Amino acid sequence: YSEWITQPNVSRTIARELKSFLLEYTDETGRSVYGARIRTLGEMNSESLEVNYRHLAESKAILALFLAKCPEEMLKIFDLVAMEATELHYPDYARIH
């Protein structure tokens, strides 16, 4: 699996995939989950984003499989994606963490 995650086309695809997941997965109210969690993350000036795995297993479940079988590579990618998502949400959050 790690040999697959580290293939650069696969890596770039995975980055787009997780970004799409964060921006489009919602509560049954239609409210974006990680939109609201990122909003809260910045308000707390936190370095941590709590991604619920069951959400990732509901949509783009292959990424949940890679995350289970190969977390060290996947979490590096997902960290970059999460920073991208919150930098999109808050400009210059790179100054805070």
Place this chain on the structure above:
Amino acid sequence: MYYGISQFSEAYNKILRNSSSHSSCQLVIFVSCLNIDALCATKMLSLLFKKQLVQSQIVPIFGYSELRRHYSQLDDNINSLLLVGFGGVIDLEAFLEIDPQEYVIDTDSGEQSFRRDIYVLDAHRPWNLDNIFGSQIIQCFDDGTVDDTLGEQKEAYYKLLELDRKQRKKQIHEYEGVLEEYYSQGTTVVNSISAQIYSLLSAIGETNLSNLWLNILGTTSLDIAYAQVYNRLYPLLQDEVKRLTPSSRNSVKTPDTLTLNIQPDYYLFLLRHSSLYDSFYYSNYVNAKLSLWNENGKKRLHKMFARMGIPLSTAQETWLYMDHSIKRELGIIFDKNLDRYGLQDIIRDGFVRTLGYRGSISASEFVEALTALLEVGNNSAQKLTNLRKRWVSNFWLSWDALDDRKVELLNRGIQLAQDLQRAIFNTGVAILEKKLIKHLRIYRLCVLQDGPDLDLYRNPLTLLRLGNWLIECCAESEDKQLLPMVLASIDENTDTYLVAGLTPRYPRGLDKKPILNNFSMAFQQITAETDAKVRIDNFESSIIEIRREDLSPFLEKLTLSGLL
């Protein structure tokens, strides 16, 4: 009218002719304490009389009762008084029990002269017309309002005075109609007393950066309650800053350089002494816009700093040690963001003074320090008097803080200002969370029955801090109608409520004609009708104090009145 702004020189020349000598003290200044603008005007005036070496006495006075006492014990050698920051809105010739024939001398000619002058330096309106026209002894320093506005009332006063049949009936009914429509106007401040003294200093040729700074301070003290007057006066202050600023450029900061810039002076609370976070958090306007008295507004303020790219720990640093790059970039960081939260009126240019190497201070911060020193600086009638004595004594801590030699006293003022605003804020969230503000049909009512820091609000200026904090919050809401407010607070020691009648006002950024305070005469009418025991001697006559048992009948009679 009595002395127009073109002829303040003539009144000052009359002062030096009558009541100046090496021989004796002859000039008394009564100044209303608990008034920053009156304080700054008196400081400017005292520097003038020091330079001209005029022997004089300053008396700080709380209210009209002490005024009548202190006037009564003046010796005939005192042939000029200056009344600063009060007295224009009451018939002083009647109230001080003047008979002009007791003071008249040297008629020759259809003419008179008098053994004592009473010059009045007051910015409150409507003028009492017995002062402006009736009296020959009272001498008001007019801003131009009389000549601009009161021609009909002038004609009505003189014709009614002349008019000791059908024509007689018509005329007397007409001019009583005019005068009883001019009176029962709500009270309002139209100028800064300090700017009037500054115009006098311009006439005499006495302007300098010290007197200009005092004028800036006295004018800046009006900004919270009387925003339109501050906006009227601000261009003239810019002119004078540029006229008196030196010609040097690339001026290296040097321990002797007094500098007085116009520069961005945001509408945050004690920015250069607070942290950044606290200067947002304890600002009246920020609290009003964000509804910061609840956790959602608190979340919004955190959201703002996060979006600005400011770490919260940096935001909470005391401003001197707060990151230099942020301090350079702050104007950009605000410009990019504060419209996004509707806080765009935070952006402002204001007067900032920095002397040598000992920091920078805006007029906003400086008046906050001075007010805090007035508020918290140092059997019932005796206890009340011993409290008013503390406030008369607090005047001299604000006075001495105006001197650069005593900046440790200014730092006392800064610290007291922070802790006072904290007390105001906690009382405010108590009021709004427990929903104390009862919405009576004509006006909103808020009565503090109990709570921490209750023993501060027996001071009028602290009560007005809380009133202004409330009024900004109500004004910046969309759902609420703009209505007058009564704020009251029990003193458990004297067993009397101190009660303040407060105007509403528009949102801070909007622009319409001014709103007047009509609690000033409504309280008088209820006082005149009632058997209750209520004191109405404060110079800010929209403030009264009343026994606890009498309040609810008083408020019931007030809300039955149509005058508000």
